[model samples]
Target: MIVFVRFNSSYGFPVEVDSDTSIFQLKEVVAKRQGVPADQLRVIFAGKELQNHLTVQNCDLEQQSIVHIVQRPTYHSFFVYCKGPCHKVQPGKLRVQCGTCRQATLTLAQGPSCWDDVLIPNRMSGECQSPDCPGTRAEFFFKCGAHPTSDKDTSVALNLITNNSRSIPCIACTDVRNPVLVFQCNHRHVICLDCFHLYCVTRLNDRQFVHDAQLGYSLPCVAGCPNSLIKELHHFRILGEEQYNRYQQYGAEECVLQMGGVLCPRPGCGAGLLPEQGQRKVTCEGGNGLGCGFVFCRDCKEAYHEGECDRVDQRAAEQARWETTKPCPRCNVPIEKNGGCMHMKCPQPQCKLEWCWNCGCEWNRACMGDHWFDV
Candidate 1:
C-alpha cells in the first residue's frame, strides 16, 4: 500500500510500501527523506502513535492516506472532524493562538496538560508577540494532521471517538477496531467506525433519522436504546460529502413537512412550499427564479384547477406509479419491476422474501415457465 508522509502541515510526499510493512520500516523511509535517523521520528496515525512492530495494515493505513511524523510529549493526541481532503474523523494537531487577535504568534506560558485544559475556554494564557496586541489568553484550535491546512482550516474536535482503551469489540461486527464510536446510551454501546457508517447510511436511506427538539435531526443507538441520540452531528461527516448532502436535504424536507409545509409535486421541483392556510391553489412562484412556476393544489398536490379536486385523477396518477410496483408476498414491501423475470427478491436487508412479480405469490417453477420473461 502507498501512503503519504506529512512531515508537517505544508510539506508531504508519497512513499510506496506494502500493507505488511512494519511501522519502523516505514519510518526508516521517512527518516531517509528528512535526512534524519529513524529513532528521531515518531509515526502517528488515527490519533495514535504506531508501534514499531505494528504493520501498516494494523494501523488501517489506506491508499493515499496520510500518517504524521510528529514528536509529542505526554502524547496529547486529538481527533478532528475534517470536512475535505480527509473527510473522516482523523488524527488532529492542536495549536495555540492569541484569543484576541487570533494570531499564531502567541507564546504560551504553559501548554495544556489535559483534554479539559485544551477544550475549556480561557484555561491558559499566553504572551502575544504580535505588535497589535500586548498579551491575550490562549485559544486552542485543531487542524487535520492528515492533510496540509491553510491558516483558516480548522475542524471540530470529535471527542466521542477516543482511544479504544477497553478493546471492546464492535457491537455489530464483533471485531476490535481502533477509534470506535461510543454512543451516549445507558449501555454505552460501541461500534466500529465502518459499522457506524453503514448504520447511518441505512437509516438515512429509510429517512428514519429522528428530529430531536434538542439535538436537531439525529440518530439514536442502532441497538434501539432510548435517549441515545448523538449530540455531535459532525460524527455523521464520515458518510462522505455526497451522502451527507442527501442526509441534510432529507432532514430539511422532513422538517418542512413536519411544520405543515407542502412540497411542489412537479417532477424535479420538490421545493418546500408553505403557502397561507386555507389557500388551496398555491403557485410555486417563478418570478424570481426561485420556484418552477408550478401552480399546484395544496390538498391534492396536482396542477391547480377549478371545482373540487378529483380523487380519481390523483389516484390514477398514483396507480400508474404503483402499476410497476408489487408488494412482496411475505413482507409486503413494495418492489418496483422496471423489466425483469417473474422472480423477485425483496430489497430489504432483513426481509429478502422471494416472490413472483406477476403472480404476487412465492417464487415457484410454475411462474418461471408462465411469465418468466413476460413484458
Candidate 2:
C-alpha cells in the first residue's frame, strides 16, 4: 500500500510499500531518501509512537494515510483528527495565532504535549508580534496536512477516532484496521470504518436509529453497550452526502412524530403537521408552500368530514375496492397485488413498504415460509 511520511520541517512524501512491510524497513527507505539514519527517526501515528517491529497492516494503516517523522531529540508535536478537503480523516498541521488579533505572528512559550494542551483553549501563552494586540494568549488551530490548505480552512477534531494502538480486530469483520472508532462503553469496543458504515446503513434502512434526549438522533455501540450512545453525530459524515441526507430526513420525521404531529396523507407530500388542539379538521396548507393543499380529518387521516370518521373511510373503501386491492400496512395506501407472491412492495414512492399480503405485516421469514404463495 502507498502511504505518506511527513518530516517535521518538510512536506509529506509518498512511500510505496507492501502491506506487511515492517516499520523498521519502511523507516530505512524513508531514511535513505532523506539522507538520515533510520535510528534517528521516530514515526508517530494516531497519537502514538509506532514501534519498529510492527508491520504496516499490524498498525491498520490505509492507503495514502500519513505518519509523522520526528527526528530524534526534537520538539514534541501534536496530532489532531482533521476532516480534510479530501473529506477523509487525516493528519493535521498545528498553527498558533494571537487570540485577539487573529494574526499568525505569535511565538508560543511552549508547544502542546498532550491533547489537553491543544483542545483546552488558552492553555498556552505566547508573545504576539502585532504591536496593537495584547493577545499574549495563544489560540491554536489545525490545517489538513494532506493538501495545501488556505488560512480559512478549518476542521473539527474528532477525538473518538483513534489509532488501533492495541491492534484490536474489528468486531464485525474481524480485521485489524487502523483508525478504528472507539465506543464509549466500558470495553471501548472498536470497529473498522467499513463495518461502521455498513452498520449505519443497515440501521438507517430499518429506521432503527434511536433519539436520545441529550445526544439527539444517534446510535449506540453494536454490542448494545450501556451508555455507549455516540454524542458526536458528525461521525455519520462518513456515510457520504446522499446517505447522510436520508439520515437527516428520517431523523426530522421521527422528531415530528414523537412530538404528536401528523403527516399529511397526501400521496406525494408527507409534510408533517401539528394541528391545533381539539381541532379534527386539518388542512394541508398551500399558501405557506409547504403542504399539498389536501384537507383531511386528523382522527382517521382521511378526507375532511363532518360526521364519524368510519363513515367517510367506509365510503372511500367501497369506492376504491377492487378484486386484488389491499391496503399497505404502513401507509394504508391501496395496492394491487396482481400476480405476485405474498411479499408485496407498496407502489407509492413515499411508502415503499415491504409487507406480506396475507398477514398485512412487515415481510418476514415466517410469512415467506408459510403463506408466500397466493391460493
Candidate 3:
C-alpha cells in the first residue's frame, strides 16, 4: 500500500508510495518534482513528526494516508524531507550468476539517511534494461509496530527490488513465477500457462451455458472484470494443443448453429451441411472430411432415402405443376411431355409403348402421318 505526502493540498498531487517507499526515498521524489532541495522540508504523517529516515512502512502508514508538510517560517517559511550533505555508499548491481545479465549498475545518492529504495550491504537494485526495469516492484514492509522517536529512525530501505526475481502469481493455481501470461483485456488479467487449458477453457464453457446466457465466450478475467472481447483473442495460445483443437472444434460447431446450415449427423462427422429447404431427398457433399457423403432425407433425416422417408413436405406438394401431366399409355402414370416431337416412349423400358409426343396419343404410322407437320 502507498502513503501520501501533501504539500500544496489543492495544487499538489498526492505523493503515492509503497511499503518500500520511505520518507527519505520519498524526499528524493519530492525534491525532484517540487523543484527544491530536500534539506528545507519536513514530512509529518499520522499527526506525529516524521524523521528524515522513517519509512512509511516503519510507522505502519495506511493506504492513502496523508503525510502533511511543515516548514520553518524564519527562512524559507516551510519544511518537509531533507537534502543535506552527501554521504558515501557502495554501488548496487544485479546478482552475479553463471552469466552476467544487466551491465548497468545503480548509483545510490547516499546522504545522512537510507535514501535508496533497496536495502544496503545485504542487497541492492539493478535494472534489466531500458530507461527503467520491467516488473521490478519493491514490496517489503516495515517491521516496526509503533511510531519511532528522533534517535530511532529505523526507516532502512528494503532490498525488495534485488535478488528476488519478479514473479506474478498464477491467478488460478496460486503459484508465483518469474514469468506470467498477461491477458489482452483492458484489465490485462494475468495467469500462468500451466492452468490455461483446465481453468480457462472450462470457464469458457461454463460462461457460455451456465447463467442462461453467453455472458462471454472467451475466458473472462475475473468475476469483477468479466467483460471479454475479441481484441484479446490472441491470449488463447496459452492452452495446450489438444485443448486448443477441442476449443476450435467447439467454436466451429456453434458457428454452424447460428448460421444458415445444420450438421451431418453421421457419428463423429459433425460436418455442417447446407439445409434442404424443400427437397424430399438429400445427397450431402463430401466436405469438411465427411467421406463419400451419404444420402439421406431432409424430412426424416433418413439414411438412404430409398423411399425410406416416412415424412412428407407439404410445401413441395403445394408447389407441384401437376396440370402439365398426361398419363403414360402403358403404365397410366401421369407424365409431362418435354419436347415438340412426334415420337414419345414410355419412361420405363418394360412399357415400351410408342406414342405421339405432341398430343400424347398412342400411335404407329397413323399417328406419325397425322403429325407430319411436327407442330
lDDT of 3 by residue, 72-132 (tens): 2010100111111211111111111111222222222211112222223324333333354
**Number of clashes recorded per candidate:** 0, 1, 14
Q: Which ten residues in a row have the lowest lDDT in candidate 1?
A: 314-323
Ranked by TM-score, top first: 1, 2, 3
Model 1 misplacement above 4 A: 1-76, 105-115, 126-134, 259-375
Q: Candidate 1 deviates by what RMSD?
A: 29.7
Q: Candidate 1 has which clashing residue pairs, if any?
A: none
**Superposition TM-score, candidate 3 onto the true structure:** 0.26
Give Cα distance to truth, residue 109, candidate 2, Å.
3.8
- Name the best candidate (by lDDT): 1
Compared with the true structure, the alpha-carbon lDDT of candidate 2 equals 0.64
**46-164, model 1: which lDDT tens digit per residue?**
43456788876676667777555643211114568787777667777667788888888887533444556567899888799999697678887877777678867988877566546
User: Against the unseen true structure, what C-alpha lDDT does each candidate score?
Assistant: 0.65, 0.64, 0.41
